[PDB]
C-alpha cells in the first residue's frame, strides 16, 4: 500500500507506520490521524481506499514530503558552502560544524579509525 511513495509495509499500525515517511514523525502522525479522523489502533492491511483518499490530500496540502525536504536540505547546506561561511568550510572539511571537540572526538563527522 504505497501512501505517497514510501510503500508502507503491511501488518503495521498507523501511528508508527506513517513515521517511515521521510518528513513525518510520531508527533506528526498524532495530527495526520487527528485531522483525518483515523484511529490510532488499526492494521494498515485493513485501510480503506476512501480513508487513503482522506489522507492523500491532507498530507500534500498541510505537510511536506520526500523529495521536497531532501532538496531543501541539500539546497541550504549548498548555500552555506557557496557563501564561504565558517559552517560551509567546516562542512566541506568534514569535521563538526557546531563547535564540537575535535581532539579525541569528531568520529561521527569523520570516518572509522585511521591509526597513522
Amino acid at each position: 500500500a504505497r501512501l505517497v511513495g514510501v510503500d508502507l509495509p503491511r501488518d503495521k499500525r498507523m501511528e508508527v507506520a506513517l513515521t517511515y515517511i521521510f518528513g513525518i514523525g510520531r508527533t506528526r502522525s498524532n495530527e495526520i490521524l487527528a485531522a483525518t479522523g483515523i484511529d490510532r489502533d488499526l492494521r494498515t492491511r485493513d485501510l480503506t481506499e476512501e480513508q487513503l483518499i482522506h489522507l492523500r490530500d491532507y498530507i500534500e496540502a498541510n505537510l511536506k514530503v520526500e523529495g521536497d525536504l531532501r532538496r531543501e536540505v541539500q539546497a541550504d547546506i549548498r548555500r552555506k558552502i557557496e557563501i564561504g561561511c565558517y559552517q560551509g568550510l567546516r562542512h566541506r572539511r568534514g569535521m563538526p560544524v557546531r563547535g564540537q571537540r575535535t581532539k579525541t572526538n569528531a568520529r561521527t563527522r569523520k570516518g572509522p579509525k585511521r591509526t597513522i
Partner: protein
C-alpha cells in the same frame, strides 16, 4: 482501440500539421517503437534473472522479453561471451501505445521526487532515452511478492528527422519536460 491512439489521430496529427509545415501528409513523425532494456550486470553473479527481470516485464510490457547475451569479454567486468547480460523488449503497435498511455496515466507521475525529466536527452535524430529505478511504478506489480528493486532504461524511437519535432511529438503524446 487505445484511447490515446484515437485521440492521437483526433488532434496530435493535425496539430503537427499546424506546427510544422510538412509538404506531404506522411512526413509526419510517429513513435516507431519503444525499446525497454535491463542492462543487468548483477546477473553475471549467481545468474539470477528469470523471476526478477522476466516475470516483471511480462506484467509490465506484457510481452516475454529477450535475454540479450554477451558479445565480447571484459576482464574488468568479470564478463565473458555467452552470459545473460541484458534483457530487452521492443514494443510496436497498439500495445506499445497502451504502454505509454498507462505509463503517463497511472505510472509515470508516481516516481519519487519527480518533476518532469530532461528534454535535452535526445540523440540528435529524434530518439529519446531515459531510465527508472523501481518496479512499484506500476500497479500491476505488488511489493509483497517481489525481490530487490531494479529499474528499466527506455529508448523511444520515432520517425522524426530531428530533435525539435521529436520533442514536439513526445510533448503532444504527453511526456513531461522541464
Amino acid at each position: 482501440q487505445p484511447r490515446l491512439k484515437e485521440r492521437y489521430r483526433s488532434e496530435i496529427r493535425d496539430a503537427l500539421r499546424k506546427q510544422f509545415g510538412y509538404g506531404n501528409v506522411m512526413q509526419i513523425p510517429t513513435v516507431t517503437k519503444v525499446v525497454v532494456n535491463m542492462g543487468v550486470g548483477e546477473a553475471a553473479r549467481d545468474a539470477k534473472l528469470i523471476n526478477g527481470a522476466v516475470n516483471d516485464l511480462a506484467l509490465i510490457t506484457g510481452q516475454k522479453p529477450e535475454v540479450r547475451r554477451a558479445r565480447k569479454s571484459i576482464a574488468q567486468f568479470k564478463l565473458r561471451e555467452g552470459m545473460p547480460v541484458g534483457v530487452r523488449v521492443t514494443l510496436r503497435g497498439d500495445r506499445m501505445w497502451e504502454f505509454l498511455d498507462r505509463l503517463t496515466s497511472i505510472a509515470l507521475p508516481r516516481i519519487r521526487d519527480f518533476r518532469g525529466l530532461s528534454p535535452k536527452q535526445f540523440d540528435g535524430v529524434g530518439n529519446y532515452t531515459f531510465g527508472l529505478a523501481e518496479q512499484a511504478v506500476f500497479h500491476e506489480v505488488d511489493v509483497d511478492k517481489i525481490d530487490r528493486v531494479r529499474g528499466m532504461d527506455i529508448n523511444v524511437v520515432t520517425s522524426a528527422a530531428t530533435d525539435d519535432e521529436g520533442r514536439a511529438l513526445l510533448r503532444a503524446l504527453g511526456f513531461p519536460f522541464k
